[PDB]
Structure formats: C-alpha cells, structure tokens
Point group: C2
Chain length 278, copies 2
C-alpha cells in the first residue's frame, strides 16, 4: 500500500512551504529576492526529505526536524549559487530559468550565498525547539552541518573538481555529493532522538546512496570540468560499474536492517529508486 511517489510529493511540498515561511522577503529586499529566487525554485528536495525521513525512522516527529531540513536545503542552494558564478562553471541556465547572478549580478549572488549559509545556522540553532531537543544535540547538529560543508566535505570536493584514476573520482563524489547527504541523514537522526549506533548506520546509508546517485548517473549517460570526462564506466568499465552499483545498493539496504519494520519503508524505496531509475 506504500506509494513512494505520493510520499515524495507530500514531503517536498511540505518542505517548500517551510522554506517560504523561513525566508520571507523584507528588510533589504534585493538580497532577500535573491535568496528566495534560488531557494524557492522547487526541486526534488532530496536532502531535506532524507532528513525528515531519518528523523521519523528513529522515532521523532515530522515537525521536529523541519528547521534542520531547511538548513541543509539552504546549504545546497548556496553551493549551487557559488557554482554558477563565472569564476567557476559559468552557467547561465539552471532548470530552464536563468542563474542567480544573471538576474541580480555576481555581487548579490556571492552575498546571497553567504546569507543563505549563515541563515542556515541561525535557523538550525534558534528554530529547533528547546522543548523537544536538548541543547547537547543541537550543538552536535551544528558541528555536523559545519563539518559537512567545510574542507572535509562540500568545499574540498569543489576545489578538487578543478586543476587520473579511481580514488580521485571517488574523492570528488564523497565530498561534493555524499557529505551533505550524510549531514542530512545524520541531522535528522540527531534531532529525532537517535542513538549513537543509529546515527552511524544512517551515516553509512547516506554515504552509499550518495555514491549510488553518481555511479548510476554515469552509467545512464552511456546507455541513454573534471567530473565530466572522468566517469565510472571509463575507469572501471561498464560491467564493473554495474556490479559496483549493486554492491552499493545492497550495503545501503543492509544498514537499514536493525531499525524495525515500519519507518524503513520510505528509505528502502528511495534506495531502490536511485538504484534502478531508467
């Protein structure tokens, strides 16, 4: 009776409403319309949905986890805004409509990215209710989100993505993609009341579906600046890439043995969806 598609839609639209209430437009406007433009451009919202999922699985409520979920989608948005800039990437179109700096300028773009990054923390720290989550856990959460974006996560992956073999590729993907996914699963588990063991199993899970996205997207492109030429089928061959993708989907499904029964359904569905898209 479980519908993955119905799940993903109600969760995403719930998240979108939260993002709208969290960054209203006011005060100095150009900056807020700049933030809102990129932040409320919709999306699959996979990172916040994964964070709400991880919270529900360990027993927390959908609402406890909302500000954490908003925080990781703000980090995600900021990483894209600073990507599209001319010094890097230099793309004028994202999802059809033009990029943030092509509408407001590279100046307001850099600044809007910084504002989203800092508001992420302000929101995770202030809006997480003091009546459900102990300060200890909010502190641990902040530390994890920050670790995830810095030089052991998102930023390390972006720098290296500019300048030969397998661990170079895996490096870029563990930091650019998997680090913030890990942060999403782990934050959900933390503020949702999860135990240390549960938090480590959700970290491993997120790391696995984070690589899986990438191996599968590289396989799909041949079956129809550095991470474009360098693909898993080029390095491993196509068969070894497919075996790799099923080792990863397996390990992801096995981290979820041990949670019981009910709230594993969405995460299992997510894993299979990423694994077997066509």
């Amino acid at each position: 009776s479980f519908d993955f598609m119905s799940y993903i839609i109600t969760k995403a639209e719930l998240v979108n409403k939260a993002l709208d209430s969290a960054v209203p437009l006011r005060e100095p406007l150009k900056i807020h319309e700049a933030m809102r433009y990129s932040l409320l451009a919709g999306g699959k919202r996979v990172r916040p949905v994964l964070c709400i999922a991880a919270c529900e699985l360990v027993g927390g409520e959908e609402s406890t986890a909302m500000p954490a979920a908003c925080a990781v989608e703000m980090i995600h948005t900021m990483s894209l805004i600073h990507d599209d800039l001319p010094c890097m990437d230099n793309d004028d179109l994202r999802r059809g409509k033009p990029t943030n700096h092509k509408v407001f300028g590279e100046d307001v773009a850099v600044l809007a990215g910084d504002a989203l990054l800092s508001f992420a923390f302000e929101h995770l720290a202030s809006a997480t209710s003091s009546d459900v989550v102990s300060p200890v856990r909010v502190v641990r959460a902040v530390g994890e989100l920050a670790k995830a974006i810095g030089t052991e996560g998102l930023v390390a992956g972006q720098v290296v993505d500019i300048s030969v073999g397998l661990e170079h590729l895996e490096f870029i993907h563990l930091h650019k993609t998997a680090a913030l996914l890990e942060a999403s699963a782990v934050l959900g588990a933390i503020v949702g009341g999860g135990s240390d063991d549960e938090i480590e199993r959700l970290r491993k899970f997120a790391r696995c579906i984070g690589l899986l996205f990438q191996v599968v997207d590289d396989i799909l492109d041949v079956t129809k600046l550095i991470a474009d030429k360098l693909t898993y089928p080029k390095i491993m061959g196509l068969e070894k890439s497919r075996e790799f993708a099923e080792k990863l989907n397996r390990e992801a499904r096995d981290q979820l043995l041990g949670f019981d029964s009910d709230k594993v359904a969405p995460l299992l569905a997510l894993a299979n969806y990423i694994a077997y898209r066509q």
Copy 2:
C-alpha cells in the same frame, strides 16, 4: 600600572598562535593555503581581542573564549576575501600584499571564504569546552554569530553599500549612514563582545551592556577616521564637522558608561581601547 600596548600585543600574539593551530596545512592543500594566507596575514586582531576582553571581564577565563575569538576573526577574514573580489569592489592589493584571488584563482577565493565561514561554526561549536561552557550558552552563541553575519548584519551592510541606494544629502542621509556602519562594522564587533560575555558565564544584563559598548566603539571607529580625513558618504559631510566631534565624544561617553557595575580592574582594557579609538592625531 596598566600597559595597553603590552596588553594588546600579548593578546594579538596569542590569537595568532590559536589561529595557526586551528587551520593547519592538511589536504587538500591548495584550499588550506588559501585560507591560511588571509587568516594569518597578521593585523590588529581587535575583534578576537575584544571577545577575550569581554570573557575575562564577566568572570570567565582567557582560554575559554579562544575558539569564539578564532571564529569571529575567521568570519572577518571571509568578509575581507569576498570584499576584494573583482565583481565586488575589485582590489588588486590588500594591505601591501597581493589579494587572495590574485594569488589563487577567484574561484579558490570564493571557496576559501566559504570554508572559513563554515569552520567558524565548526570550531565554535566543537572546540568550545563542554565543561566550562554549557550547551545552552553555546547554542545562544551560534545564534548571535550567525545573526551577526546575515541579513541583519554584515551582508545587509555590504549590499546596501555596493547596492542601492542612498541619499547623501546632509542631514537627510543621516540614517542611511548609521545603517551602513551598524551593519558593516558594528554588527561583528557586537557579536564578538557578546560571544565573549556569553561564553565567560556573564548574565543576560552584562551581555546587553557589552553589546551596547561594542555598538558604540563600532560607530566610534568610523566617526573618528572620517574626522581625521578632513585634516563619498562621510560624517562631516552628512552631519559634521562640529556635530561630528560632539557625536564622537557622546559615543565615547556612552561606551564608558556601559562599563559601570563591573569590578574595576578587569574593565581597564576596555576603557583603554575606548579612549584609544576616541583620541587620535
């Protein structure tokens, strides 16, 4: 007797050692060299020192506030790195040295600023001692620093400044002027004093008086350097020159009045800093 310069030199030197140790050269290296380059290029280090001062005044220990101080100076560094970008007030030279985006790419500059901003929070949350400072206070701190950087602080100031728009007519543009300086300079001064107070164990009342103190010397920096430059948008031309001198001495008074009630020997550095900023030639 109390020696102000001896104080500021031992304190800055202490901060410098703290920052070198918090951002070592690890991998990947080019980014760590980009961060280190701007973070350890020396400087007066007034914000972290203000934060340490504020911690000691409310009863806390010097070492307690050290990660908070490193956080505010990292944030400050990012604000300089992103100030210099070509899209933003392009500056080929910072200090006397070439700018961060002129040594590494502009891309590595943007990313280094992002790594510094994030490490501020990682370091403030992770490295702050869990048995001297309660998590409740660490949470409040994360919030004050974040608020300080955002659109109610630093970034609101850098936008209304390089972005639209103000009227510089005297005496109309007066509240435009205050706005730019309350956000571009004083927001982060307020955060460092407040961080210092929060983490030193100070009460909700100490904290608001040190917040006002910091707001006053933050405005004071600006009024005084504008007064010295007459010896686009400035205090003597919007308000001054005489009304500016009285404004600067009102600000010095009020800053000195925020310190009554503390015990009179750990106020000496803050008083000295105030009088120093206030009186130049």
